Design a protein around this ligand. Structure first.
Ligand SMILES: CCC[C@H]1CN(c2cccc(OC(F)(F)F)c2)C(=O)CN1Cc1cncn1Cc1ccc(Br)cc1
Ligand SMILES: O=S(=O)(O)C[C@H](O)CNC1CCCCC1
Ligand SMILES: O=S(=O)(O)C[C@H](O)CNC1CCCCC1
Ligand SMILES: O=S(=O)(O)C[C@H](O)CNC1CCCCC1
Ligand SMILES: [Zn+2]
Lengths: 318, 486
């Protein structure tokens, strides 16, 4: 049986404060007794600006019932810092919230604030936790954004070693080996190899990256993630499309990877993004009529869901 | 008008090929293709003159959807507690959907909406997700409350707009407390930083005439650095210090953050500051937008990111971003000196056939088959359906006519900036800013003759506005109130 807080000796000094909705609010929610009672006492705690262990316990009760309650999370973090609580213990509590499927923008942001304030000399333990947490959802957007933030923040402090960057690419390569269609892991590869400020740009690194992209396309020719990464790569580094055309032309029906002599089964031709590559390489050669003819086929035969877009591109050729 | 918008029923439906390379992504894609294509198979083609016997009729079940939303004005069950910090969104999703569906609220119910929202307004500035004695202000409930007051309020003494006007300085001060030096904003005290906050803040600042130079500094750079190599936008960018030496996008391109980024950047192009806003790659954003429309076997709905599943709410996020991307491309084509840009027919077919709750049930619209309908997917499906039905464009001649009628001698008191040099330089510059921002905010039109109503005129819903996502007949008197025009 539930015991109301008005009947708890530890709370006898506190006068609860009711929610001030007005007399007949729209979108009212039928709250459980436990949740209303806890919020009635939270309003009083926050009114008197009490920073205490009982206030800390109360915030945990509330965010277990509603993990998206940003006001109570904000109050909880100020309780932790005011009381100089163990932030490593709090991080262990957040590990449980993930386990019991308590999640939101607010919980993820709480974890970031903890890491920021702990400011570990080496964040390797948190990196490994984040990697393991991707097991039930390898495309969790919050998790990938948090991983980006963690490496960016701690690299700004000089705390990501060359060995650490190297094993992060190793982990990224394995993620794409298990599912080459994971566009989140492709985005992470872009950070690791291209956009992060410490990335190497040399003729070797450009050659290596192009080899990995082309091998990935030859493994899964219909994988949009690989085509988009190829197009972004070439564009970002101002590299011509034409010299690579030998590897792309077999999909539109020399040193760098070529398609399998017989193509993999279940690979119907043409691949529409291969045709887009061909049209753009025609434009690079100033062969606008040839480009227009390819756009026209994309519009009327091969990618008809985008008939209007491909017609727009066709008309731009004139 | 449908030459380049083929119906899903007229195209060959075929699965995403496997290349003999199975993966978890492909397992889910194939299962979703089966769900959606089977429902299309049981449903009569909306484009037929007489509906087929034995098959489901796809007409928009407007009265079912109205009844679904009606719970908002009585009570929500106890499992709504997860949205207890989002109650202004429950209001907005309800009252904007009713506007789209053409259903009027009586004055007593509108007055309850206004009164409820004003209890969420805190005296120090901004709306929270619930009562001000319970929740701190937040940028996202502030947008939802402001737009809801545009839909349900009025200019009288009980209409709420008068209270908003009196709160302009405190809301501005809340916005400046949220501001980061790099151009991001926290969504609330101690809250996260992303382009949802930027979008919500810029909409409200535009509508209430509280934009200043100090408010906008670096905001364009934060947003522009969110663009990824795919052409869409991520949630945020990270500033690396020597202001920052460079900024890097923090996650993958996503339909919701791409909408927020395109809309934010579009609102900034109205602001007459020198070399502002920093440009984006509009062509790449348009390309990314159109590539997210699904194949015929998935009903022509939009996905929110590459290699994930279609979902009706991206009809608004991605589809509603298309006219903005199109306008930015047009401006750049003009600067360097006609068919629809996505399949407007197929998106409507997805909405009617796949996103409606099955008939004779709760009503409402949903993510996809197999998912319960909710208020958020009801609003976003209908907002995206509106964009597909009505051809929206930003009209330079309309903006020009707006400039010609603006009265700069009318307006509310100028906001007092936080820092001494943070305001406009003089009245000539401030009034020029007010004129440009007002005149462009009112520049969206529906093109005469561009209407496409799949399934017949009984499926027509009202026209929403790109960027703001409220009806033009709400936007115009609301923004005119705060700028003291007509
Ligand atoms: C209760 C609705 C939850 C929904 C929408 N939502 C949101 C709420 C208020 C405002 C807002 O944005 C803005 F700018 F303030 F209006 C966005 C979320 O946070 C998460 N969502 C989950 C979801 C459903 N189907 C796709 N998603 C992913 C997704 C992620 C980010 C974005 Br953006 C859009 C969709
Ligand atoms: O699908 S909707 O248009 O939203 C509403 C439902 O059709 C209700 N149908 C009624 C059945 C009995 C006769 C009166 C109409
Ligand atoms: O005077 S104002 O600052 O504008 C309004 C109050 O201070 C804010 N109310 C608090 C919100 C969070 C829970 C406890 C009450
Ligand atoms: O205006 S038109 O597009 O020519 C045709 C009408 O809208 C047809 N709507 C149906 C009528 C019968 C009941 C179900 C809806
Ligand atoms: Zn959705």
């Amino acid at each position: 049986t539930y015991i109301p807080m008005s009947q708890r000796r530890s709370w006898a000094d506190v006068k609860p404060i009711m929610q001030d909705d007005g007399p007949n609010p729209v979108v009212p929610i039928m709250y459980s007794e436990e949740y209303k009672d806890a919020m009635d006492y939270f309003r009083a705690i926050a009114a008197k600006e009490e920073k205490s262990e009982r206030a800390l316990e109360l915030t945990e009760i509330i965010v277990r019932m509603n993990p998206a309650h940003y006001t109570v999370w904000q109050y909880r973090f100020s309780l932790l810092t005011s009381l100089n609580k163990s932030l490593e213990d709090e991080l262990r509590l957040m590990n449980e919230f993930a386990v019991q499927n308590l999640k939101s923008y607010q919980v993820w942001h709480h974890r970031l604030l903890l890491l920021d304030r702990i400011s570990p000399q080496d964040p390797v333990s948190e990196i490994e936790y984040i990697h393991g947490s991707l097991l039930p959802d390898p495309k969790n957007y919050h998790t990938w954004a948090y991983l980006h933030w963690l490496y960016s923040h701690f690299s700004t402090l000089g705390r990501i070693s060359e060995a650490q960057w190297g094993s992060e690419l190793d982990w990224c390569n394995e993620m794409l080996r298990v599912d080459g269609r994971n566009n989140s892991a492709w985005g992470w590869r872009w950070y690791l190899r291209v956009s992060r400020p410490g990335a190497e740009t040399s003729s070797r690194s450009l050659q290596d990256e192009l080899i990995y992209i082309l091998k990935s396309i030859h493994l899964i020719p219909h994988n949009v993630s690989a085509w988009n990464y190829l197009r972004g790569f070439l564009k970002h580094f101002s590299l011509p499309l034409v010299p690579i055309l030998p590897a792309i032309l077999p999909y539109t029906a020399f040193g760098f990877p070529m398609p399998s002599d017989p193509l993999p089964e279940d690979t119907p031709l043409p691949v529409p993004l291969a045709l887009e590559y061909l049209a753009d390489s025609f434009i690079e050669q100033n062969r606008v009529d040839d480009a227009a003819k390819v756009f026209e086929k994309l519009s009327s035969e091969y990618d008809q869901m985008r008939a209007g877009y491909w017609e727009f591109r066709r008309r731009e050729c004139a | 008008a449908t030459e380049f918008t083929p119906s899903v029923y007229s195209l060959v439906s075929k699965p995403l090929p496997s290349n003999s390379r199975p993966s978890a992504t492909l397992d889910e894609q194939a299962e979703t293709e089966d769900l959606i294509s089977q429902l299309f198979d049981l449903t009569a083609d909306p484009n037929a003159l007489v509906s087929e016997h034995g098959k489901r009729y796809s007409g928009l079940r407007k009265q079912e959807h109205t009844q679904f939303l009606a719970s908002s004005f009585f009570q929500l069950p106890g499992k709504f507690v997860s949205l207890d910090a989002s109650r202004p969104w429950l209001v907005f999703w309800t009252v904007h959907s009713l506007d789209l569906l053409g259903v009027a609220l009586d004055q007593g119910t509108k007055d309850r909406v206004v009164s409820t929202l004003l209890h969420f307004l805190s005296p120090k500035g901004g709306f929270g997700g619930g009562p001000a004695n319970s929740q701190i202000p937040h940028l996202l409930p502030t947008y939802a409350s402001v737009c809801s007051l545009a839909i349900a309020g009025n200019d009288s003494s009980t209409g709420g707009w008068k209270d908003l006007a009196a709160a302009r300085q405190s809301i501005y001060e809340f916005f400046m407390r949220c501001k980061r030096p790099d151009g991001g904003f926290v969504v609330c005290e101690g809250g996260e930083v992303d382009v949802r906050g930027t979008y919500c803040l810029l909409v409200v600042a535009t509508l209430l005439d509280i934009i200043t130079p100090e408010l906008l500094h670096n905001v364009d750079k934060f947003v522009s650095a969110c663009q990824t190599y795919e052409g869409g936008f991520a949630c945020a960018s990270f500033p690396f210090p020597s202001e920052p030496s460079c900024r890097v996008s923090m996650a993958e391109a996503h339909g919701g953050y791409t909408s927020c980024s395109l809309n934010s950047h579009f609102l900034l192009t109205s602001v007459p500051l020198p070399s502002f806003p920093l440009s984006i790659d509009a062509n790449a954003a348009l390309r990314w937008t159109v590539l997210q429309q699904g194949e015929p076997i998935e009903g022509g709905g939009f996905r929110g990111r590459t290699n994930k599943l279609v979902d009706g709410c991206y009809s608004w996020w991605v589809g509603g971003g298309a006219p903005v991307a199109e306008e930015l491309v047009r401006r750049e084509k003009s600067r360097k000196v006609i068919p629809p840009i996505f399949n407007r027919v197929a998106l409507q077919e997805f909405t009617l056939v796949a996103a409606q709750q099955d008939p004779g049930s709760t009503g409402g619209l949903r993510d996809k088959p197999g998912k319960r309908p909710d208020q958020y997917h009801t609003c976003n499906n209908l907002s995206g359906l509106s964009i597909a039905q009505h051809k929206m464009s930003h009209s330079p001649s309309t903006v020009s006519s707006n400039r010609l009628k603006f009265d700069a001698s009318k307006g509310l008191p100028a906001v007092k900036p936080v820092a001494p040099g943070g305001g406009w330089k003089n009245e000539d510059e401030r009034q020029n800013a007010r004129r440009e921002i007002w005149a462009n905010a009112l520049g969206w039109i529906e093109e005469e003759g561009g209407e496409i109503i799949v399934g017949g005129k009984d499926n027509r819903i009202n026209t929403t506005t790109p960027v703001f996502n409220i009806l033009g007949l709400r936007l115009k008197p609301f923004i005119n109130y705060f700028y003291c025009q007509e």
